[PDB]
Specification:
Catalytic activity: an alpha-D-galactosaminyl-(1->3)-[alpha-L-fucosyl-(1->2)]-beta-D-galactosyl derivative + H2O = D-galactosamine + an alpha-L-fucosyl-(1->2)-beta-D-galactosyl derivative
Largest sheet: 9 strands, antiparallel
Protein name: A type blood alpha-D-galactosamine galactosaminidase
Number of strands: 40
Structural class: alpha+beta
Family: Belongs to the glycosyl hydrolase 36 family.
Bound molecules: chloride ion, cobalt (II) ion, manganese (II) ion, zinc ion
Helix content: 10-25%
Shape: globular
EC number: 3.2.1.-
CATH architecture of the largest domain: Distorted Sandwich
Strand order of the largest sheet: 8-9-10-11-24-19-18-14-15
GO molecular function, one term: alpha-galactosidase activity
CATH class of the largest domain: Mainly Beta
Amino acid sequence: YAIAGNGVRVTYDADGQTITLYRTEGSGLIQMSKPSPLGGPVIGGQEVQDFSHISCDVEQSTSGVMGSGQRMTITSQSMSTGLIRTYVLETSDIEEGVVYTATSYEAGASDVEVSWFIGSVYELYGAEDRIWSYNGGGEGPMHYYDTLQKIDLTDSGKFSRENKQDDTAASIPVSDIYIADGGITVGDASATRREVHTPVQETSDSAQVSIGWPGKVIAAGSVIEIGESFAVVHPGDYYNGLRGYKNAMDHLGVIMPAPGDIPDSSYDLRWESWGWGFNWTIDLIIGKLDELQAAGVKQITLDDGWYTNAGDWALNPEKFPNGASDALRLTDAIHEHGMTALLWWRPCDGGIDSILYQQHPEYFVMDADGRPARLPTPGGGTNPSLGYALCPMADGAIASQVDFVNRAMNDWGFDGFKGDYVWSMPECYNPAHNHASPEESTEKQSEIYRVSYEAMVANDPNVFNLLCNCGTPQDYYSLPYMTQIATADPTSVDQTRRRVKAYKALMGDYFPVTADHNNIWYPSAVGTGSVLIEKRDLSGTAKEEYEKWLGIADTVQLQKGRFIGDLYSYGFDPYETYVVAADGVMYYAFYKDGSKYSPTGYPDIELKGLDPNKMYRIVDYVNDRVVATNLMGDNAVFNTRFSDYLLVKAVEIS
Ligand SMILES: [Cl-]
Ligand SMILES: [Co+2]
Ligand SMILES: [Mn+2]
Ligand SMILES: [Zn+2]
């Protein structure tokens, strides 16, 4: 029993009751998964093991979620539970590598209490010494836990992570595992946020990636759909899998902004007002504008500390003694220097001591004990800076966000927003809100992002919008409403660079991504094709360094180039490598300073994706030196010694 789509084959063995995934390679196939069991329900702490094969029906010409392709419907039965499982896999004639899966269960004569449903599981075939993984979970740890994780198969430990999305986790419902021959992505096939896990788990000699959803009581005689997923078989690294997921999710209407509609000002070099921490003043910021302008900065963020309280989002009198005219004199000065002005905020936060909470507690999320619910940190808990959550279904909550947007743009002259320092959305138990379920607040969190952005756009179609779910992968359902993504308080060059590739994969190769400014890593910012940003008040050689790198970034402008993620595989090619095509020229960036993946010694550099019949001069554009005089495209291999990074362009020679 088998179905095929573009670049994928799926086979079902009725005896073992297993699925095997293959991808196409040349005229053949590569097995990507070991024969893997169908996902089942968890009852009384145990996955049900007694399912038997009833039927597998293959339809060769059918139309599904992804349009025309194929379908395989597997029916299974459990005598102990009375459950009949219907497991549907669909492939697409067009969508490369993608398998859509949907599961329903029918109960027999009696109710079945399921704590959890495992949707699909795939154990990687052909692993050797390590597997690399993309982990989209929002459960934290914040900041210092890498999104990209190496699963070492030679050590003592056993990697295991749930990758949650729930009332304390709002990130990306996707996981990928890959080796040299490629990988398997699994992601939630839902147009809207829901509770889901995408676990990554080391096995005896490999790893498995899976997806699962919360259980429910299945009433006797009832049929219930329990969850739907996309899987992507792919060559190469997580970029290819995540790109497959992006392509799949288009069919559910989760469509990321098209390149042609992204504003010019969302590609601009930016400085953010953290030169003095919370002790910035309007005049300190204005005092920097001449030098920032001369060095090539085109955008300024007024960062945290400008407001009285979250929710209210009124000007702090200490920062704005003359009120709105002070905000205007700031944004006017920014505009006069040829720059756009951005404003910091924390969407979803209605404050604690805010007038908003005092006058309108009914706008807020209410916990099960009848108390106002704090916004959660990843994995649970809160933070002293985080106020009470606005309920995204409360009209007054939404209006407070819209009113803020309209004031900041139309009264204060801001051109966009830096949303920051917020994660998931607590469950709401306020009876007056009449929620379908307590999870509805969590599910509807992104309504805040959508409505806010729609208001922003109505004022200015070129408005800038960014949201930082700091130290975690960004809330996936926020992404359609953004004009730029930050890697989100990366704590290492490894984090910022690898996340640039992940965000490019999910958002599009021209989607603006910044490598952020938590640490100074200008080469990482330029070479990944990211927007170089900064926040410090620099002097002396550090100032010169910033000016140098602004000049490079402003010359090559790789932030506006086409990111190319499918030529090199992170953790398998000799160097951590990034590629951007800008104005017809291939730019490459090789790094050794990322401790998570760095070669022994000085491997040869191979430039891929050049024309085989052409000859190229390889130029280090940072240092303006020729590192290789003349390479043919089909053998573009050279050796150069560098300590941390090498940024080169391949210049065609005639
Ligand atoms: Cl990372
Ligand atoms: Co942040
Ligand atoms: Mn291990
Ligand atoms: Zn509510």
